Motif scaffolding. Sequence first.
Motif, short mmCIF file in Angstrom:
data_model
loop_
_atom_site.label_atom_id
_atom_site.label_comp_id
_atom_site.label_asym_id
_atom_site.label_seq_id
_atom_site.Cartn_x
_atom_site.Cartn_y
_atom_site.Cartn_z
N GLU J 105 18.99 40.89 9.00
CA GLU J 105 19.49 39.77 8.21
C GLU J 105 18.81 38.45 8.56
OE1 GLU J 105 21.86 42.15 5.90
OE2 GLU J 105 21.08 40.09 5.68
N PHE J 106 18.54 38.23 9.84
CA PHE J 106 17.88 37.00 10.25
C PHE J 106 16.41 37.01 9.86
CE2 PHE J 106 21.55 35.95 13.02
CZ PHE J 106 21.65 34.59 12.72
N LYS J 107 15.83 38.20 9.70
CA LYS J 107 14.44 38.30 9.27
C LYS J 107 14.38 37.92 7.79
CE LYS J 107 12.52 41.48 12.62
NZ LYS J 107 11.80 42.76 12.85
N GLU J 108 15.38 38.35 7.02
CA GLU J 108 15.43 38.01 5.60
C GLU J 108 15.62 36.50 5.50
OE1 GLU J 108 14.31 40.43 4.27
OE2 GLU J 108 15.75 41.98 3.62
N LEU J 109 16.56 35.97 6.28
CA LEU J 109 16.85 34.54 6.29
C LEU J 109 15.55 33.76 6.52
CD1 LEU J 109 18.89 32.36 8.69
CD2 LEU J 109 18.36 32.03 6.27
N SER J 110 14.82 34.15 7.58
CA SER J 110 13.57 33.50 7.92
C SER J 110 12.57 33.58 6.77
CB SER J 110 12.98 34.15 9.17
OG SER J 110 11.82 33.46 9.59
N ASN J 111 12.44 34.76 6.18
CA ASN J 111 11.51 34.96 5.07
C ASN J 111 11.84 34.18 3.82
OD1 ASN J 111 10.79 38.44 5.86
ND2 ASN J 111 9.77 36.53 6.48
N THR J 112 13.09 34.25 3.36
CA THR J 112 13.43 33.54 2.14
C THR J 112 13.52 32.03 2.35
OG1 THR J 112 15.82 33.23 1.59
CG2 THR J 112 15.08 35.47 2.03
N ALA J 113 13.90 31.60 3.55
CA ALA J 113 13.99 30.16 3.83
C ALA J 113 12.59 29.59 3.79
CB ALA J 113 14.62 29.92 5.21
N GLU J 114 11.62 30.37 4.26
CA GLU J 114 10.24 29.93 4.26
C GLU J 114 9.70 29.75 2.84
OE1 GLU J 114 6.02 30.84 6.45
OE2 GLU J 114 7.83 32.01 6.93
#
Lengths: 144, 144, 144, 144, 144, 144, 144, 144, 144, 144, 144, 144
Positions: J105-114
């Motif tokens: 979930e935090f990897k998705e967060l990092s990816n989409t936030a970017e």
Amino acid sequence: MKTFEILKHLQADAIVLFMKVHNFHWNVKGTDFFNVHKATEEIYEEFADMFDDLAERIVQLGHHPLVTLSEAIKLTRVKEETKTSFHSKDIFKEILEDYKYLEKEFKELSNTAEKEGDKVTVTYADDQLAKLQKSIWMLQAHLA
Amino acid sequence: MKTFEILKHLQADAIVLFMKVHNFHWNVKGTDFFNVHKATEEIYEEFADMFDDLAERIVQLGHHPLVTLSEAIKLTRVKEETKTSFHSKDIFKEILEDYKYLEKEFKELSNTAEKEGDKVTVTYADDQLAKLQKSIWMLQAHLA
Amino acid sequence: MKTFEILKHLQADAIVLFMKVHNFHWNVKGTDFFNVHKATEEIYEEFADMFDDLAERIVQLGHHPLVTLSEAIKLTRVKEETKTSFHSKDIFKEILEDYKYLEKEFKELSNTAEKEGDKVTVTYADDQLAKLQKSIWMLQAHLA
Amino acid sequence: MKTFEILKHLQADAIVLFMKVHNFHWNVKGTDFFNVHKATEEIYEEFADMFDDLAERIVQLGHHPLVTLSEAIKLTRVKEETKTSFHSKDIFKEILEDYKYLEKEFKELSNTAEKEGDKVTVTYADDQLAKLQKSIWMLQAHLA
Amino acid sequence: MKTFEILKHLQADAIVLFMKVHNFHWNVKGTDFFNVHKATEEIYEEFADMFDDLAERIVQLGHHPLVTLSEAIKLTRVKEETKTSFHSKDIFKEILEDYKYLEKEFKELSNTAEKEGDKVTVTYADDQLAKLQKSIWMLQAHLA
Amino acid sequence: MKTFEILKHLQADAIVLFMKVHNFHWNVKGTDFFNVHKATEEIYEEFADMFDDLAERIVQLGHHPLVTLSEAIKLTRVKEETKTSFHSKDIFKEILEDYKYLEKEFKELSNTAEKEGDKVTVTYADDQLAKLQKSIWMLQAHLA
Amino acid sequence: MKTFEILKHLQADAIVLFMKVHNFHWNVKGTDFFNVHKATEEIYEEFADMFDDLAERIVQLGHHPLVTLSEAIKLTRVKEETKTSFHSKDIFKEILEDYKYLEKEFKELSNTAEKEGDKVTVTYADDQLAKLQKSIWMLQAHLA
Amino acid sequence: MKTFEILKHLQADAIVLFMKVHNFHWNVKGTDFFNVHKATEEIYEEFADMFDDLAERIVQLGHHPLVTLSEAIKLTRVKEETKTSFHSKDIFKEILEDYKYLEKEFKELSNTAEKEGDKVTVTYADDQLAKLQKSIWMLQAHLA
Amino acid sequence: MKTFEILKHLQADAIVLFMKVHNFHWNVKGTDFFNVHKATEEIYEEFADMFDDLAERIVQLGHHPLVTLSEAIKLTRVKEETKTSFHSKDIFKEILEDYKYLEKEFKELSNTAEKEGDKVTVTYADDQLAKLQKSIWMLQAHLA
Amino acid sequence: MKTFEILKHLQADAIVLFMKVHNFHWNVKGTDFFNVHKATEEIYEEFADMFDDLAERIVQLGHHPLVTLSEAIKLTRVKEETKTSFHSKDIFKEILEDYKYLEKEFKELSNTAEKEGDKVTVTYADDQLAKLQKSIWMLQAHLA
Amino acid sequence: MKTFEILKHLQADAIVLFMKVHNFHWNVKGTDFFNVHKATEEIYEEFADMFDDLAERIVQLGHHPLVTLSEAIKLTRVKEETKTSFHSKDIFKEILEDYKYLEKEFKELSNTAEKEGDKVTVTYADDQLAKLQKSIWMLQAHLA
Amino acid sequence: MKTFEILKHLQADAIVLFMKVHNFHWNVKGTDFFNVHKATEEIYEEFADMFDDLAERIVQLGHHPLVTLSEAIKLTRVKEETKTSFHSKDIFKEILEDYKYLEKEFKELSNTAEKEGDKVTVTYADDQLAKLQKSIWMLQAHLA
Ligand SMILES: [Fe+3]
Ligand SMILES: [Fe+3]
Ligand SMILES: [Fe+3]
Ligand SMILES: [Fe+3]
Ligand SMILES: [Fe+3]
Ligand SMILES: [Fe+3]
Ligand SMILES: [Fe+3]
Ligand SMILES: [Fe+3]
Ligand SMILES: [Fe+3]
Ligand SMILES: [Fe+3]
Ligand SMILES: [Fe+3]
Ligand SMILES: [Fe+3]
């Protein structure tokens, strides 16, 4: 018994227990060593404090506290441990046994102190009861 | 005696002295109260530490430390105090007497440990000697 | 050997042991993880200090300390561990083995430094002996 | 000399050195100012402690410590510095000279205290030797 | 005198007093021991600070501070104590005598520094006056 | 290289640098001694931490960290210093040279970790880059 | 000038000096780097405090403090430093020059505040004078 | 009385006692000075806290606490001390007298609060009782 | 008045103000509660200290401080507040009124102490003036 | 999802996990008790912080965080644990399972936030990733 | 602009903002005084740090930081506040305006630093962005 | 209900309240922001502790604590807040409402625990009552 008599017996058990958990502290064997060596130290530090509080409550009450190791082993209800080598499990079973015994004694203390109208000995007893009951839970959980 | 035998006797005296200065701690009378009540606490805190160090040195040495109050009063060279009321002067005379006794014992410890080649017990003994000698001076100055 | 030669060998073992317990620190497996991960860190912190003290004692003595990892593996008496996965028990057996070896070396250091009249290297050696002997006891108790 | 006589001479040097490094402390000149001003303070703080320890060891030994500045300059082996302006280099050469002198005195102290069987004065002497030898190294490295 | 001359005399008294209260510190006898042993230490710690502040104020003022014990006993107005054994009462009478003397000197310092327009030496003098006057009260109350 | 391969090389340099700045730490000569002796200690403390972080990142990444000094000198890109005496200037030139080398390596780490999508190794690399760049500035300013 | 006018000029110099020692802080070159980088930080921290105290004293006095950098460079008596690279010596000469200037200003402040009967501004001025005079001594000793 | 009425009387005694032990604090005479000066400070610090707790308990209870010194001397049961010079013994006899009086009042508080079902005022009362009883013991031991 | 008479009046106001801000402390109403409840506590803590300092300065001066609440309300120039409920604004107006009154009194203290040559009472007065003037500014800003 | 939607889901999991590890915290059984009881406390303390950070990031982003337990169990991807008794092994397997889920979930967060250009949410995500990855390693090592 | 040019502009704004919030700090009026007086201090402490970090990043980057207040007001994008009296609301509106401006600048910094491959300036920019965004939220909530 | 049933309901309210004050914590609007944001954090920290104590008391009592958020919202007597924006006043009215509700529940707990002879649950209940009653007073004063 009278409040001060219960206090003196409890004082006797405190010094005997202080010696007993030192034994567990020095002679633990097993991969559990560091933890029980550390835990037993905190426990006997507590008995040293209890020993002092009980005694001072007795003098505040106008009576004589035990002042010799000889009087202490004459008044204890705690059996002394002569063995010099233990494993975690046996140490915790014994400590649990002694804690349950102390809990009964502090309940009597609380009850008889209340009948005498001794407000402060009652709160002292109830505070020790709280600590004992939390540790008994943890000891039992550990042995489960 | 052998080093471990001297250590066990010293361990016995430590727990007996721990109890003894508690007596002075609780039962001091006089305008000196606060000071000796405070001083005796520091002293028995020290005996509690000595008691633990002696015992652990014995197990490190491969022997058995005293594990019961019963063995302790069987091995002490220290007489237990049965009185329950004291004045500053008498308390310090007794403590001085016991300190001088401990100093002789630690000198023997240091001497016999050295003959056995026990380097670390020797430095332990010499460190306790240092503390004892400083306190003996202060005790004597106080009684002068 | 001469005191400074014993010091250089000990210095070599310190850096090799520093690396070795890091290995145990990173590669422990088992429900024991947190404890040994934590313990090994304290241990290599100690070797880092010993490494520095030994080296500085050597320069104070007017000699050259080891200044390269290459000289170190040429002088160690400690075998390097090539494995990359361990369980608590094996880690403590090895550490115990190496501690017993260090104890013998520090006894030689103490003995030969004394013959040379090197008072301060002797007390340094005796202090390390004290720490080593306490840990050896705990390691052995743990493996019992 | 007897142990207490060596102690009194050392006590005399301590107070004289305490005054001497204060001089260096106040009168340093040069881009080195902050460092030596800071270092000299730590040094005289140490001499103040040494001065007190030596004196108390003497009373513990049953003798009289120097109690006046007059007795002190009568017993020192340290020459007093009358100049009031210095540069880093000269300050460190003098301190080094005095440190080397103290080291010889503490070696005598250690040696004669040992012959008398004075265990605690010996360990005191050896501890000061350790500090002196580390500082002598640093002083010499600085002047190289 | 000029401000710097008063400062040098005060500096001389500080080091002489530093030595003097050490004497009281080591040689007190009586049931008062612990308290005066403790109090005298705080007092000489203060004189050590005063000694340093006075000297640095003198160099800031462009003059030379005393740099030898020899110059100090040549400039003091304080008599050195040759006795080596005292009781609480005598110690406090002497300290009181010397404090009253210092108070007069700091009043002169404050007065003459003010005439010269030396603002910062005046506030330094007034701060020391404050500390001295509080202690003089306590010393006098103690002797009443 | 792959991220873990860059990490292992960096880990090798960390332990080699840890040893190298210890050499500078023990063997500095000159009026600069105290400062560089103090600075080098902070530096090798940092390399010890870096050494541990790199290794643990490698195991978190599912690979094997270097576990022997032998593997380390086989993988370093850092030349070991065999000399045993230095002056401030030479020490800082070498440290600067090695820091610039580490900066290039951490830039590669950051770049290749990013291509692999290794978010946390990238932030680790960038944080070390920040520390290295600040120190490189200070080292260069010092040598100017 | 009136007290508040002297205060505003001093406030102007504080912010200008705050900026100036930051310049020395960032742009020092030489083997002196760490020390002056560290010292200049303590100095500008002090100017930041002085800047705030001066301003608040002005509002307590019922006047307006400078509230813009523009008003500040219009009121300073301190010349701004445009160079971006310095060596220890030049930095300390400038700081010394500015400190001597501040000392004269605080003496005027103290004098005119006294004539107006402004007791608290006078003690503030005298306290700053004390700090300035101690630093001026150290700066001068450093440049000697 | 009702609980809040007992609380207001106790609040009145707290501020009166706060003033009274300040008197003992400032006007003690005798070699006991430092100890009683120190002890009385701790005591009035306690009364200041009690004064505040009592008052806040009263507002929590929905009533009005005393808000003027005038109401306080109208409600106290404590006699004010007009003398301005005392010796240790007399100070402790008075404090003991007042403590015994407070103990009776807190027992009433505890008893009547319990009848009203005021659980929290009861525990507050019992806690103060505990502190009072310990101090009464110490005061009595001191006067024995 | 004479200095000690001004001191006694100030001492009277301190204890009366101590009681008064406690009233504000307990009885504040409004969304401002937490802040003024917190602020008033710091304020009465300060008055408690002032009360003690004033009294001790009086005994140092050789006079008698007020020792009863009765003497205090006989000497105050501060009116006692009988109300038991307030809002932020009214509390700060009163505190401001009383602070302005104290400022005038401390100015007289400073002036008359100076004429008598009482250097230390003058600096005490000037320090309190500084604190009062800063708070008066903040109080006024708050009410603007 | 959009960044704020991922944040809300993560916020939901944080409070659910906070409750879940409390369960493990209270109901652990076995000789492992003390360690896991201690570890789980640190873990839920962390989730409490994460819960708060996630929520505040959402409001900073201009959206609504979950504000009820009801919304939370509606949004979690974490299954709630209904059992009330566990042994070390099972507790760590579950925590590991949930940690691996959070890492994704935090990897998705990092990816989409970017992709959205949300610089600060990306660094927040990457920091949590770092902590999660270190713990996952330790959890896995423990279960090996 | 180039990264270093953005850094210099940001550095200019930092010192201008440092001065500006000091104005708010000294001249706030209203029942809000204590809170904003306290808050503004924390804010300018932060700008002082930012001012120093920006400048040092510029020198690390090989460029010249602003070194005079004159260059600063020539480069700011922040308007200086000439008013000398404010109420909470107006202070927070201005701070909010300036914070929003800084946020845009740090976003540019982050973006252009990234294009240049300046990894560490990017993380610095992103960290400041995080702090700014949290404060902007709080400022806006306050004004709602 | 039985004591453990009251404990479980209280435990349910604790976690629900923990979530509820977080809502107030994140969504406060108004010039009151900083204070209530800060206060609500202390409050939910307290509920987190209460949540844990209640649960552990239940297991000590031999029963099952709530272990899921689902059981919690099934047992609460506290209504969940769905709104996402509030002003100080409304937040404090709600918290006050919930506190008054908790006070009634803790009174029942205390009463029924007493009838069962559960000494330690009674003192726990009475301690929480004390904290609740003090906060209720402050909440009410704030809303007045
Ligand atoms: Fe006690
Ligand atoms: Fe132990
Ligand atoms: Fe070192
Ligand atoms: Fe001493
Ligand atoms: Fe100095
Ligand atoms: Fe690690
Ligand atoms: Fe300020
Ligand atoms: Fe209060
Ligand atoms: Fe006082
Ligand atoms: Fe928060
Ligand atoms: Fe900086
Ligand atoms: Fe818990």
